[PDB]
């Protein structure tokens, strides 16, 4: 129920520009004697020229990387060079920039090597890629380029009757679209790697279709090799729940999940039914604060007491006080939109203190909805490498802990 | 009674013109002493040239879009560049502007990407497309160009006995005209998309 399906991306490293200028120097000497008169002179000449159109060649340094569950024999991408709201050239890789093998979770070339270079647009490698003079003006003013992936072409391996395998005429393109017609897309992101899988779903409309269906929690348990331990889910000693990560849906799948959850008699998002086209992102958080165990924190929380600390569902400690954490900027990533999120309790007056500069310095009352356990989430923006401290401080009157709280990355969020 | 029949169109985004000019600057110094007389001078030179015919290269930014009930494996269109009641060049897409997949009701590239570029007329990508000087006059006066679709060439997928599917030698061209001989054409347009189908009819004769 999980399809072998390699994903290929291209990463940019550096860009080398080259001006196709022309320079020249000349020197001459003149002597004359005529009948009495003489003449001796020296002439110098300095010259420079340039002909627009093929006035700036370029080359780019890329490397490839795989993520999925399959290799990709004889890989070939195509790229598009965008400069400023436009495109410059679309390049397919020729015979020189091709790649033989790509084992899943690796790179071409390997980790202990330097990147790859590409500079030509012709089918055989001649005639390097040019740049217009006004594009050279926009470039040397400071506006830099960026890259993309568009499509890839590669082969799989199958064995014939003689026991050897063949990779010739077996493309991967003619199985792309069909898979993307019948599957849901699940993307996990830890702090070291990423993973992207496709799991088939059940079209409930047409009744001849016999596909055994699952739920989204079952599909997460089935796709990744993840151990059910005491009912919860663990993956490479990492806890994964509906309560301990950050879930990202786009709005159409979010609306489907929304109007499907209202009719179900249980509030666990892992029990909703899977559907045909869904796009789910699971981001793990960096710093998790279960007050029973596993709090990877340098500084310690204040005003804690242990009567039934298990995370959610069992916290029953309700008293006055404050919790505070100061952690400097040095340990965390600069220039990124961090997200601080936790859960609820039933205190009466409780507010959050975030003194952090270059960010949301808004302090807000909690407005405790009920004694039922719901989330809360806020965001802020990271400055560049000061000793100024991250200071979180929860002042509460009638709760000393609720045992789920975290801060997370929220990546694809740069500053400038 | 409804035939699997993909329709392909081409959309224009932007056009980049480039002048194939030539510029040069030169500087020289002269000194002389003769027997008493002396001379010191400085010469400067500025020059520009242009040779008509291959006097303006261009590139265009297009994207593809599908509407119908089928994919189109290894898609390739052909386009015609019209300027002012005439044509300039007919371009088939080479190996660089080809497209692998096109799921119905989508685009190549995807929605979250930038468009595609095409600039060459040779079979292998060299010798970008030129523009006559008088066409450059008509262009820089303000008269802009527009694009078309003319024909497309692509493949379908069929499975052999071993359970895998093949897309090689199966063209879509040799089923175009037959369908357009026996069917009625129905085009629906909502405010977000469009749809175009072909339904077979009954020759009563």
- Tell me the two tokens of residue B9: 């169109």
A79 burial (CB, 10 Å; 0-12 / 13-18 / 19+) is: buried
Which residue on chain B is closest to A179 by alpha carbon?
B103
Q: Which of A37, A49, A180 sits opposite B23 (nearest CB)?
A: A49
Check CB contact of B127 with chain A, cutoff 8 Å. Answer: no
Gap between the Cα atoms of B180 and B157, Å rounded: 21
Q: Label the pairing between strands A279-283 and A183-189.
A: parallel
Which distant-in-sequence residues (6+ apart) come within 8 Å of B118 by Cβ? A90, B59, B60, B62, B79, B91, B93, B96, B97
Query: Which string of DSSP letters, residue by residue, matches A168-226?
Result: SS-BSGGGHHHHHHHEEEEEEE-SS-EEEEEEE---SSSTT------BHHHHHHHHTT-
Say if CB A302 and CB A292 are below 8 A apart: no
Is cis: bond before B109, omega within 30 of 0? Answer: yes
Asked if B114 lies within 8 A of A176 by C-beta distance, the reply is: no
Asked if A177 lies within 8 A of B71 by C-beta distance, the reply is: yes
Residue B95 Cα, gap to closest chain A Cα (Å): 8
Say if CB A329 and CB A357 are below 8 A apart: no
What is the separation of C-alpha A114 from the centre of its chain, rounded to a whole number of angstroms? 22
Strand, helix or coil for residue B201: coil
Gap between the Cα atoms of A43 and A31, Å rounded: 11
Say if CB A338 and CB A416 are below 8 A apart: no
Q: Which of B28, B59, B96 sits opposite A92 (nearest CB)?
A: B96
Gaps in chain A (C to N over 2.5 angstroms) fall after 35
Asked if B103 lies within 8 A of A49 by C-beta distance, the reply is: no
β-pair partners for A23:
A48
Chain B residue numbers touching A132 (CB-CB < 8 A): 16, 18
Using CB atoms and an 8 Å cut-off, which of residues 77-106 of chain A contact chain B? 78, 80, 82, 86-92
Q: How many CA atoms lie within 13 A of B75 on its CB side?
A: 24
Asked if A53 lies within 8 A of B20 by C-beta distance, the reply is: yes
Which method, experimentally, gave rise to this model? Answer: cryo-EM
Q: Which of B22, B25, B96 sits opposite A90 (nearest CB)?
A: B96
> Which residue in the block uniquely carries the two structure tokens 């089918």?
A123
Gap between the Cα atoms of B93 and B112, Å rounded: 23
Chain B residue numbers touching A181 (CB-CB < 8 A): 103
Check CB contact of B44 with chain A, cutoff 8 Å. Answer: no
Gap between the Cα atoms of A224 and A215, Å rounded: 14
C-alpha closest to that of A212 among A199, A223, A225: A199
- Tell me the two tokens of residue A342: 């936790």
Gap between the Cα atoms of A57 and A126, Å rounded: 12
Gap between the Cα atoms of A167 and A159, Å rounded: 9
Chain B residue numbers touching A39 (CB-CB < 8 A): 32, 34
Strand, helix or coil for residue A406: strand
Which distant-in-sequence residues (6+ apart) come within 8 Å of A311 by Cβ? A243, A290, A292, A403, A404
Using CB atoms and an 8 Å cut-off, which of residues 52-71 of chain A contact chain B? 52-53
Residue B203 Cα, gap to closest chain A Cα (Å): 33
Chain A residue numbers touching B170 (CB-CB < 8 A): none
Asked if B28 lies within 8 A of A45 by C-beta distance, the reply is: yes
Gaps in chain B (C to N over 2.5 angstroms) fall after 35
**CA angle A361–A367–A369, rounded 5-degree value:** 140
- Tell me the two tokens of residue A346: 């039933």
Gap between the Cα atoms of B7 and B70, Å rounded: 9
- Tabulate helix, strand, coil % of chain B (nearest 5): 10, 50, 40
β-pair partners for A196:
A187
């Amino acid at each position: 129920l999980v399809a072998a399906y390699p994903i290929v991306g291209v990463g940019m490293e550096k860009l080398i520009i080259s001006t196709n200028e022309h320079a020249s120097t000349d020197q001459g000497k003149t002597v004359s004697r005529a009948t009495v008169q003489d003449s001796n002179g020296e002439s110098w000449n300095t010259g420079l020229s340039i002909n627009k159109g093929e006035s700036a060649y370029i080359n780019a340094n890329v490397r490839y990387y795989n993520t999925g569950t399959a290799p990709m024999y004889k890989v070939t991408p195509t790229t598009n060079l965008v400069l400023d709201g436009d495109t410059l050239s679309t390049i397919k890789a020729q015979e020189n920039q091709i790649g033989n093998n790509l084992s899943p979770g690796d790179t071409y070339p390997k980790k202990g090597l330097s990147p790859l270079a590409l500079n030509t647009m012709d089918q055989f490698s001649s005639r390097l890629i040019p740049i217009n003079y006004d594009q050279l003006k926009k470039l040397d003013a400071g506006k830099q380029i960026k890259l993309e992936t568009t499509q890839v072409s590669g082969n799989f391996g199958t064995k014939n009757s003689s026991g050897q395998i063949v990779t010739e005429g077996n493309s991967w393109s003619d199985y792309i679209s069909q898979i993307d017609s019948i599957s849901a897309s699940i993307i996990l992101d830890t702090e070291n790697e990423s993973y992207e899988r496709r799991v088939t779903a059940k079209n409930l409309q047409d009744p001849e279709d016999k596909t055994p269906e699952l739920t989204i929690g079952e599909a997460i348990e089935k796709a990744f090799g993840a151990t059910k331990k005491d009912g919860l889910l663990y993956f490479n000693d990492i806890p994964i729940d509906e309560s301990c990560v950050e879930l990202i849906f786009d709005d159409n799948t979010a609306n489907k999940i929304k109007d499907s959850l209202k009719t179900l008699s249980d509030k666990k998002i892992y029990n909703v039914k899977l559907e045909r086209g869904m796009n789910i992102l699971i981001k793990t958080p960096t710093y998790f604060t279960n007050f029973d165990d596993y709090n990877n924190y340098p500084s310690t929380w204040s005003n804690v007491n242990t009567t039934n600390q298990d995370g959610l569902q069992g916290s029953a400690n309700k008293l006055n006080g404050e919790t505070k954490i100061k952690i400097p900027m040095s340990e965390l990533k600069p220039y990124k939109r961090y997200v601080f999120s936790g859960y609820s309790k039933d205190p009466l007056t409780s507010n959050s203190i975030i003194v952090k500069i270059k960010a949301k310095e808004e302090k807000t009352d909690y407005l405790v909805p009920e004694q039922g356990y719901t989330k809360f989430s806020y965001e802020f923006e990271t400055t560049e490498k000061d000793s100024s401290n991250i200071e979180i401080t929860l002042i509460g009157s009638g709760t000393t802990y609720l045992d789920n709280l975290s801060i997370t990355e929220l990546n694809s969020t740069p500053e400038i």
